[PDB]
Design a protein around this ligand. Structure first.
Ligand SMILES: Nc1ncnc2c1ncn2[C@@H]1O[C@H](COP(=O)(O)OP(=O)(O)OP(=O)(O)O)[C@@H](O)[C@H]1O
Ligand SMILES: O=P(O)(O)OC[C@@H]1O[C@H](CO)[C@@H](OP(=O)(O)O)[C@H](OP(=O)(O)O)[C@H]1O
Ligand SMILES: [Mn+2]
Length: 275
C-alpha cells in the first residue's frame, strides 16, 4: 500500500500527494533520476517528479513503489561485486578515518578476521570493512547480495550477512515467494526485460553504478514488480569512456560487475522455477 505505513508499523518522509514518498535529496541521486526519466530505463526506476522543500530541507518526490499492492512483501538486493567508490581507496591510503563501529561488526561475525594492528586500534578503514562484507556474503562471487526482507505479516529481517552460496541465496527466494508460481514467473519476465533495457541504455553504458538495489515487491493477489533504486553513488565516466558491467573490477577500471550479478540472479530464479 505505502512504505511510510510500514515505517510507522531514516532518509524517507510521507508526501502530501497520494501514491508518492519523499527521500532526502543528494546531488548525485538527483542528477541520475533526472537523466533516467529520459532514458530507456524510465520504466525500470521509480517516477521522479522533482524536488520539494519541507522544514527547510530538500526532498526528491518519488513514486511509492508499494502503492499498487495489497499487503506487499519486499526484498532488497544490493547489485555489484564492489559496494564503495574507488576514491575511498585513495582516502584510506593518504588520510584514513579509523571506524570503531565497523571493527565491532567484523569481530562479531569472525573474531579471527581483524589483523593484530586492527585489534590494537579497535578500528578498521571503510574500504577494508566493505571488502570483508563483500567476501562473507555473495557479493564478491555472484555480484549481488540479499540485504533485507519485509513480510506481509509486518515482520522484517536483515539477518543475511553470511548468505553466500548459490543454494543459500536460492533458499531465501524460495521462502520469500512461498510457492506462488505466478509471482516467480512475473519476477523472471520482469528481470529478463530489465536486462534487455540495461544492455541498450545510453545512461547505463556511460555510468558506474555502485550501491544500487533491485527492489522485489509482490502480494497475495499475485501482483509482482521489480525496480532499480538508490543512485546516491552512481557517477558518469570521463571523456567518452564506457563500462561492459561484466568484467572483473581492478582499481582504475571503475567496473561494477552489475550485469554479472543480474545474470547470476536470473539463473538462480530460473533454477528455483524448475524445482
Ligand atoms: N520509491 C520507493 N518506494 C517505496 N519504497 C522505497 C522506495 N525507495 C526506497 N524504498 C524503500 O526504502 C529502502 C531504502 O531505500 P534506498 O536504498 O534508496 O535508501 P538509502 O537510505 O540510500 O539506503 P542505503 O544507502 O543504506 O542502501 C528500500 O529497501 C525500500 O524498502
Ligand atoms: O554492512 P552494513 O549493512 O551495516 O552497512 C554499512 C553501511 O553501508 C552503507 C551502504 O549501504 C554505507 O553508506 P554509503 O555507501 O552511502 O557511504 C555506510 O557508510 P558510512 O558509515 O561511511 O556512511 C556503511 O556504514
Ligand atoms: Mn540503498
Amino acid at each position: 500500500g505505502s512504505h511510510m505505513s510500514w515505517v510507522q508499523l531514516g532518509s524517507f518522509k510521507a508526501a502530501g500527494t497520494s501514491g508518492l514518498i519523499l527521500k532526502r535529496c543528494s546531488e548525485p541521486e538527483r542528477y541520475c533520476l533526472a537523466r533516467l526519466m529520459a532514458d530507456a530505463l524510465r520504466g525500470c526506476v521509480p517516477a521522479f517528479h522533482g524536488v520539494v522543500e519541507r522544514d527547510g530541507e530538500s526532498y526528491l518526490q518519488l513514486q511509492d513503489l508499494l502503492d499498487g499492492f495489497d499487503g506487499p512483501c519486499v526484498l532488497d538486493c544490493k547489485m555489484g561485486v564492489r559496494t564503495y567508490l574507488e576514491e575511498e581507496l585513495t582516502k584510506a591510503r593518504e588520510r584514513p578515518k579509523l571506524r570503531k563501529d565497523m571493527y565491532k561488526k567484523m569481530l562479531a561475525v569472525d573474531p579471527e578476521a581483524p589483523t593484530e594492528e586492527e585489534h590494537a586500534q579497535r578500528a578498521v578503514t571503510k574500504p577494508r570493512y566493505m571488502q570483508w562484507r563483500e567476501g562473507i556474503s555473495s557479493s564478491t562471487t555472484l555480484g549481488f547480495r540479499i540485504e533485507g526482507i519485509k513480510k506481509a505479516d509486518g515482520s522484517c529481517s536483515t539477518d543475511f550477512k553470511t548468505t553466500r552460496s548459490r543454494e543459500q541465496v536460492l533458499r531465501v527466494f524460495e521462502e520469500f515467494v512461498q510457492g506462488d508460481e505466478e509471482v516467480l514467473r512475473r519476477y523472471l519476465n520482469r528481470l529478463q526485460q530489465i536486462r534487455d533495457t540495461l544492455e541498450v541504455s545510453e545512461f547505463f553504458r556511460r555510468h558506474e553504478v555502485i550501491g544500487s538495489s533491485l527492489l522485489f515487491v509482490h502480494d497475495h493477489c499475485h501482483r509482482a514488480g521489480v525496480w532499480l533504486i538508490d543512485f546516491g553513488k552512481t557517477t558518469p565516466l570521463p571523456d567518452g569512456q564506457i563500462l561492459d558491467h561484466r568484467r572483473p573490477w581492478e582499481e582504475g577500471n571503475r567496473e561494477d560487475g552489475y550485469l554479472l550479478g543480474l545474470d547470476n540472479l536470473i539463473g538462480i530464479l530460473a533454477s528455483l522455477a524448475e524445482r
